[PDB]
Amino acid sequence: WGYDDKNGPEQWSKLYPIANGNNQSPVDIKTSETKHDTSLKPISVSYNPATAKEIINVGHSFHVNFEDNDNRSVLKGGPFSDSYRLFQFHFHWGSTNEHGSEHTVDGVKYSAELHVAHWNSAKYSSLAEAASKADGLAVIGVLMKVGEANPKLQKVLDALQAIKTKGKRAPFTNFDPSTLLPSSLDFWTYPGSLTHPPLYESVTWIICKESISVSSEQLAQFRSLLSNVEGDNAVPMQHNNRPTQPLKGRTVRASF
Ligand SMILES: C=CCOC[C@@H](O)C[SeH]
Ligand SMILES: [Zn+2]
Secondary structure (H helix, E strand, O other): OOOOOOOOHHHHHHHOHHHHOOOOOOOEEOOOOOEEOOOOOOOEEEOOHHHEEEEEEOOOOEEEEEOOOOOOOEEEOOOOOOOEEEEEEEEEEOOOOOOOOOOEEOOEOOOEEEEEEEEEOOOOOOHHHHOOOOOOEEEEEEEEEEOOOOHHHHHHHHHHHHOOOOOOEEEOOOOOHHHHOOOOOOEEEEEOOOOOOOOOOOEEEEEEOOOEEEOHHHHHHHHOOEOOOOOOOOOEOOOOOOOOOOOOOOOOEEOO
């Protein structure tokens, strides 16, 4: 279902009718209309870098998958009364620097977006179980602003040369993806979804107030990943970021 136009995000509603749904992501975050809430607690990431397993090229993006067999890597606080388990981080990016981030704040589009994904291990057995569940997934979203080169992106960008093409796997160990997060975990939260098929309406978004930085060259790496299988003609992975979607009257909550 890629991000072309043949497979691209307009074609998503055919196969996945949930695309023209009510809890679709990303969204625009209109700060004027955002109802501050104080029942919210502060977000608290406790990741353990020995959970870091693998980095894999999945054709449309690349993942960094984590060990999700126990509660060693948890997110808790925010709205969540439960304690979600970390399983993955990945990125979204765009063809040019001007766009690339999925969420937008007051119409402003960013270079890329980081997703640090979690699944509700207090209520569910597997990721596979919690994938589809309303209270299934907790994803931290960081907005990535084109400027200085982020030195905490090092290990991620280094490893990329070993997963040039779709399906390529490699061990990525000994990394806490919290080091990626901004210093201010002031956050918006809203009831969302995945941003790509199967677009499950299972995500409680945590969108960070403060941005992290990425140079144009760091973004050029993301782009010089290849969507093709090894041997085939080099088809870069140019953009993998979704249009912002109607709120249909959900209430983005501030935590600031
Ligand atoms: C399957 C990977 C992670 O899914 C959670 C979403 O926040 C990524 Se848009
Ligand atoms: Zn994502």
